[model samples]
Target: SMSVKKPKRDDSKDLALCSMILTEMETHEDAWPFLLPVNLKLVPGYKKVIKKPMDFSTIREKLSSGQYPNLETFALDVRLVFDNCETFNEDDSDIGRAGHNMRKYFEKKWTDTFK
Candidate 1:
């Protein structure tokens, strides 16, 4: 049997937003200490599955498998990661700026008018 696209979405925007988020996250890491250590206390099997910071690159690595079916869900997940930094990053810091930039990118218009 052949597979079909479910609840069709704007693939262009989905890919664009994904790319934007990844770039910002990487830029943030280079500009500041944007660590995403897995909370062992929150992990049920810390010793077996948790040992280092969660890698955002996994998003792209799993893209071919459709792990992120849509941009809406993807944005929510990315937001959670950024929100996790609230305890450590000040609003005026580089990490905070990167988070803000990510938000801006998500809300940006996808028109050719600016081009």
Candidate 2:
């Protein structure tokens, strides 16, 4: 028997979802560390360790520019911001804790919205 093909997803809807999620993250109390790109001058060797630095501002720009092709791709960039934080900061540190909290918030939102 032939299987039915899934209909194409409405990208506009996904974009709106991403935007909403980004807005929430931006306003979150624990979002300070991830709000902007890490300053290379302030954190020496950051570039060497985190090859792909991601931040909320960058993600927002990408969303507005239609850089993310799908929801999964947008999710990946969101995860990357937290992953990079873990790579550079100890779990017990302030920034690290903020990253973990932000990640938890985002994952919960993602599951609630799409899963």
Candidate 3:
């Protein structure tokens, strides 16, 4: 659960306040010079929600828990793994075209009502 939602800066990137600090540091000096940031301990009781075999339950747990480093990364990974159920054929036939259309139909319907 998010105790606090991150407020985006004036630039409107949906980025957190800490990101602005890092950016300012990079303006004059390399943020990596100190490198105390990553090496420092992350928030306690909040373990990185990594999973094996990459399935729905694992993804959901991490996603719903806001465990991702950023929302865009989570969204990108979801799009990448989302099943389209499409197929390809050696010959461009009527059936192949029909199957592709049907797959698209179901996908649109799924996105519309399910999501």
Candidate 4:
């Protein structure tokens, strides 16, 4: 199987966050899944509640734990990843499309909601 390149700087965090979201959704697909599908597989069963603890944490554990001081910087850090991350297969542009949608989700869900 092909593999994704290891992202540096902002992309590194982006990959980490994306991976975490995938893990959580995959783990709890029956009970909870993202309204937006990450990776490729689309889950059918879902609820607002998760069936299991997330395998990893993205912004929640990173910034909320005080690793980052404010939303301005945290948001920027998160946004930077949009340009750098990628999907596993070099032949597929789906990864890029997914990233774009993910950015919109963040903007609408987090940015617009809070700002």
Best by lDDT: 2
Off by over 4 Å in 3: 1-53, 83-115
- For each candidate, what is the lDDT? 0.53, 0.92, 0.36, 0.43
Q: Residues 1-115, candidate 4, lDDT per residue (tens digit)?
A: 2686665344435434543543443354231222322332343332232232121234445544656554466556545445433322132465556556655655664533344
lDDT leaderboard ranking: 2, 1, 4, 3
Winner on TM-score (3 vs 4): 4
Kindly report which residue pairs in candidate 2 clash with one another.
Answer: none
Point out the worst 10-residue segment of candidate 1 by lDDT. 106-115
- List, in order, the clash count of every candidate structure: 0, 0, 0, 0
Q: lDDT tens digits, residues 1-115, model 2?
A: 2687688665667889889999999999999998888898898999889999999999999999989989999999999999999998999999999999999999999999888
lDDT for model 3: 0.36
Model 4 spans > 4 angstroms off: 1-58, 86-92
Q: 3 or 4, which is superior by lDDT?
A: 4
Estimate the overall C-alpha local distance difference test score of candidate 2: 0.92
The C-alpha RMSD of each candidate to the native structure, in angstroms, is: 7.4, 2.2, 20.4, 14.5
Output the lDDT of residue 92, model 2: 98
In model 4, the clashing pairs are none
lDDT of 4 at 86: 33
* Model 4 TM-score, 2 decimals: 0.41
Which one wins by TM-score: 1 or 2? Answer: 2
Q: Please, what are the lDDT tens digits per residue for candidate 3 over residues 48-111?
A: 4222123233434555565767645544443322221112232265534543544344345435
Per residue, candidate 1 scores C-alpha lDDT tens digits across 1-115 of 2685568544665666566656655565342333344556875564464233334554445454678776666655555555554444577987667666654553453222121
In terms of TM-score, the best-performing candidate is: 2
